[PDB]
């Protein structure tokens, strides 16, 4: 719709990512629940400067911080870009990042289309 309620749309988009299974029945978001701890993953933090995960995004959602769809988009962009920065194209993480990002955008586009 051209006239949307961002708080509502952001809740739906989070739920989309939270609940999605691929055709193999894999709950792809499970790979993104927790980012590696800084003090336990020096290789990851050589290539990732600002970590984020679904725990953080869920907390922000609960705190009502997503009142602009662009803010949620930026957080998922970071979430998936960080994964693609460390993990290589053949990895489950990279593949799931590409798939969930594309799902995010497609779902978003249906909510905010003219």
Author numbering: 41 to 154
What did the original publication write about this model?
Bromodomains (BRDs) are protein interaction modules that specifically recognize ε-N-lysine acetylation motifs, a key event in the reading process of epigenetic marks. The 61 BRDs in the human genome cluster into eight families based on structure/sequence similarity. Despite large sequence variations, all BRD modules share a conserved fold that comprises a left-handed bundle of four α helices (αZ, αA, αB, αC), linked by loop regions of variable length (ZA and BC loops), which line the Kac binding site and determine binding specificity. The four helices form a deep cavity that is extended by the two loop regions (ZA and BC loops), creating a largely hydrophobic Kac binding pocket.
